[PDB]
Amino acid sequence: RTPEHVYLCQRLRQARLDAGLTQADLAERLDKPQSFVAKVETRERRLDVIEFAKWMAACEGLDVVSEIVATIAEGRA
Amino acid sequence: QAMTKTLRTPEHVYLCQRLRQARLDAGLTQADLAERLDKPQSFVAKVETRERRLDVIEFAKWMAACEGLDVVSEIVATIAEGRAQ
Structure with missing residues (x-):
């Protein structure tokens, strides 16, 4: 923890919400079950980079990637 | 290498290629980069040769240590599109 x-999980959820996507809608876009989205957003499942890319693309958030990763890197998370 | x-x-x-090229572009040996990440050299070697998985937070730190936060968007978009070069 x-x-x-x-901070990452916050941004992941907010990207989904900003795309007007239910957890089930996002899972369909990713070709994953609803449980995958659920567990990621509760921090029970850590994403790798590839999963991160796919999630943000599916949320139409590739434009906020740079800011999310910079914030994490810089200690401002 | 089971992994x-x-x-x-x-x-x-592709991701691994970009991780390595970020390091090499910053003029860092695997040891130099690991030192900046407070990791053993084996961490860097293993990530680059697909012997260890990288999470997003580890990616952020690696790219920042390589002064490559500017190419993060390109790396992630390329991965996303399945053009995965």
Whole structure:
């Protein structure tokens, strides 16, 4: 449990919500079950980079990627 | 290397290429980069050769240590599109 991981999950959920996507809608876009989205957003499942890319693309958020990753890197998470 | 069987997709191979090229572009040896990440050299070697998985937070730190936060958007978009070069 860290600020960076807590901030990441916040941003992941907010990207989904900003796309007007239910957890089930996002899972369909990713070709994953609803449980995958659920567990990621509760921090039970850590994403790798590839999963991160796919999630943000599916949320139409590739434009906020740079800011999310910079914030994490810089300790401002 | 049991792990690299999980890390064989075009996207992993591309990501790894970009991780390595970021390091090499910053003029860092694997040791130099690991020191900046407070990691053993083996961490850097293993990530680059698809022997260890990288989470997003580890990616952020690696790219920042390589002064490559500017190419993060390109790396992630390329992975996303399945053009995974």
